[PDB]
Ligand binder design. Structure first.
Ligand SMILES: CCOc1ccc(Cc2cc([C@@H]3O[C@H](CO)[C@@H](O)[C@H](O)[C@H]3O)ccc2Cl)cc1
Ligand SMILES: *[C@@H]1O[C@H](CO)[C@@H](O)[C@H](O)[C@H]1NC(C)=O
Ligand code: NA
Lengths: 29, 582
């Protein structure tokens, strides 16, 4: 189903942006 | 010839004249700052609309619809890549160019590395790239649309189009072009939407596109010429991965790793390192207006898939014997071109679907698309020439002579483009859209590599950045020249190119050339003297004060918060749409 491929792409992107906020919060300050 | 067409075109010209006159009444064009950087007074909505309109030309209608028709929906990749890379421009590149106080991107490299020679080299390389990859695609696609929709002389009409865009460019400056590009963005999206609606009605909805397109083969697959014969079922049947952005990494026409990495490298150059796009951000009033403008541009860069690529596919379903012709003699009868008629896709819809009044609107769309792109390239090329090259020849010039020289370059680049028209017309069919992306993939990645190392590795010195660029040019040309020597041909009449040149996709070569230019830049940098660059490094990216020793890129935290959350929303929407059509 296209809709589910879309949602899984978005899910993985929100995990990667959460990882970006994690890494800079602990490794820049 | 029906009055309604002439009234719509006249109304479009009245809008363009009117917004031009309002901008000339408002702004100062007597100074270099005013004429070339719009006073650095442009708010988010002209920044966004101007990024969009300087980017979308007649090439995007002809090329993307044609490639849509030929190959299905993975060319949306070209447009959709831009989305992520415009966030790199607003959050990484634009802060550094604002804190450096540059008018041109060769000047940024002057400031960052310090010789006279990188600036001259990148100006001259950019000027050639604008003739080869940007003016050529606009003039070519204009001439397809006139040949097919109007039937007029494709020399006189391109002379005439170039002359009106010359006047439109020289009469105002960047400020008139950016306000007029808000009207041109409106006309382009609105007319393109009305044609998309007529197209999608004709195939019987969005479902109609996706259940008729893989069936959409021509009935004329046998040539009268011996040693062409029965045309292969691979050359006339639509590709089985037609509905998929992410295509096979080895046998894809646009492989997914080439699309994602290789276009990011080439788009990096196009959006983040190149005068035409970046001059709109250099004219931003604030960093936060550039960031908001960058989001507007990314949303509008989603729109090409539905307004151009999918109408192109609908054109293949409705006119499969004309748009999806393979027999060399039928394609000569249809569109004059033995190698294919995919380029008629968009203009065929306009001719065959639009009523008496809205044919004129679609001429206004293509006029708007072509004029906005050509005006941007002429103004930016003017800036690049005036500021970089003519201040080498005359340093004590002053702001009245430099504007004269700026307006006279626009006349010269119009004349060069008229003399360039027959050479671009020698490109046969949808080959040219491949040629322009191939040229960009052979010449731009060294430039992307230097700007990335200019911004993120402060140890890179002038020797590294210059010999990185030249080594890169040598590697580029080592592919480019062999390729252009052997030709392209077509699926029906293959070119006789080895598969160790042309066999690897040009966006895969873009990746290799980026890392090889980059590796050589770092290597030559590390094997020469580290040049403390004054000690200021507001010419580099950092989080920690973006500086070292107006030029203050601190924005209001509330408006910062807003653009930062709309960039993540805009990425989430993008990634959804990449997921959906992968
Ligand atoms: C596969 C061959 O077929 C094609 C490919 C691309 C096009 C459209 C097109 C795209 C670009 C810009 O290309 C840049 C990268 O070179 C992007 O960073 C930008 O976002 C695009 O806007 C320039 C000219 C054209 Cl015509 C039509 C047909
Ligand atoms: C084309 O294929 C048909 C059978 O499908 C055959 O009769 C004919 O000889 C072929 N023509 C050529 C020129 O190879
Ligand atoms: Na345009």
């Amino acid at each position: 189903q296209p809709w589910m491929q879309g949602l899984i792409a978005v899910a993985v992107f929100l995990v990667l942006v959460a990882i970006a906020f994690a890494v800079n919060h602990f490794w820049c300050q | 010839d029906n009055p309604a067409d002439i009234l719509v075109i006249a109304a479009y010209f009245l809008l363009v004249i009117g917004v031009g006159l309002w901008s000339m009444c408002r702004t100062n064009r007597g100074t270099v700052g005013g004429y070339f950087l719009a006073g650095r007074s442009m708010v988010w909505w002209p920044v966004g609309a101007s990024l969009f309109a300087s980017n979308i030309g007649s090439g995007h209608f002809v090329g993307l619809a044609g490639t849509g028709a030929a190959s299905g929906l993975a060319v949306a990749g070209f447009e959709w890549n831009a989305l992520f890379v415009v966030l790199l421009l607003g959050w990484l590149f634009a802060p550094v160019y604002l804190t450096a106080g540059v008018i041109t991107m060769p000047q940024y490299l002057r400031k960052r590395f310090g010789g006279r020679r990188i600036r001259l080299y990148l100006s001259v390389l950019s000027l050639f790239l604008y003739i080869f990859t940007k003016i050529s695609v606009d003039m070519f696609s204009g001439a397809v649309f006139i040949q097919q929709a109007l039937g007029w002389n494709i020399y006189a009409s391109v002379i005439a189009l170039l002359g009106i865009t010359m006047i439109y460019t020289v009469t105002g400056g960047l400020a008139a072009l950016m306000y007029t590009d808000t009207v041109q963005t409106f006309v382009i999206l609105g007319g393109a939407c009305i044609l998309m609606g007529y197209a999608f009605h004709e195939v019987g909805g969005y479902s109609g596109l996706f259940d008729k397109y893989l069936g959409a083969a021509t009935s004329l697959t046998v040539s009268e010429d011996p040693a062409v014969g029965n045309i292969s079922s691979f050359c006339y049947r639509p590709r089985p991965d037609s509905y998929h952005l992410l295509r096979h990494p080895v046998t894809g026409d646009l492989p997914w790793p080439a699309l994602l990495l290789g276009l990011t490298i080439v788009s990096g150059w196009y959006w983040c390192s190149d005068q035409v796009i970046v001059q709109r951000c250099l004219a931003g009033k604030s960093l936060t207006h550039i960031k908001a403008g960058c989001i507007l541009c990314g949303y509008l860069k989603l729109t090409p898939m539905f307004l151009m690529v999918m109408p192109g596919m609908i054109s293949r379903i409705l006119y499969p014997d004309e748009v999806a012709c393979v027999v060399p003699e039928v394609c000569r009868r249809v569109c004059g071109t033995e190698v294919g008629c995919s380029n008629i896709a968009y203009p065929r819809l306009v001719v065959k679907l639009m009523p008496n009044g809205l044919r004129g609107l679609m001429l206004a769309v293509m006029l708007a698309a072509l004029m906005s792109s050509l005006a941007s390239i002429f103004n930016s090329s003017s800036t690049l020439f005036t500021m970089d090259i003519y201040t080498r020849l005359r340093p004590r010039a002053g702001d009245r002579e430099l504007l004269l020289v700026g307006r006279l370059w626009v006349v010269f680049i119009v004349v060069v483009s008229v003399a360039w028209l027959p050479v671009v017309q020698a490109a046969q069919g949808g080959q040219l859209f491949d040629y322009i992306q191939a040229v960009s993939s052979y010449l731009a990645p060294p430039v992307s590599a230097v700007f990335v190392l200019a911004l993120f590795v402060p140890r890179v010195n002038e020797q590294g950045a210059f010999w990185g660029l030249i080594g890169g040019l040598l590697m580029g040309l080592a592919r480019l020249i062999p390729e252009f020597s052997f030709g392209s041909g077509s699926c029906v009449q293959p070119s006789a190119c080895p598969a160790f040149l042309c066999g690897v996709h040009y966006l895969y070569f873009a990746i290799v050339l980026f890392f090889c230019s980059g590796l050589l830049t770092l290597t030559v940098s590390l094997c020469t003297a580290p040049i403390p660059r004054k000690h200021l490094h507001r010419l580099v990216f950092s989080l920690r004060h973006s500086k070292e020793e107006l030029e203050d890129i601190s924005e209001d935290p509330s408006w910062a918060r807003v653009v930062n959350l709309n960039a993540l929303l805009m990425m989430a929407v993008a990634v959804f749409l990449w997921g959906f059509y992968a």
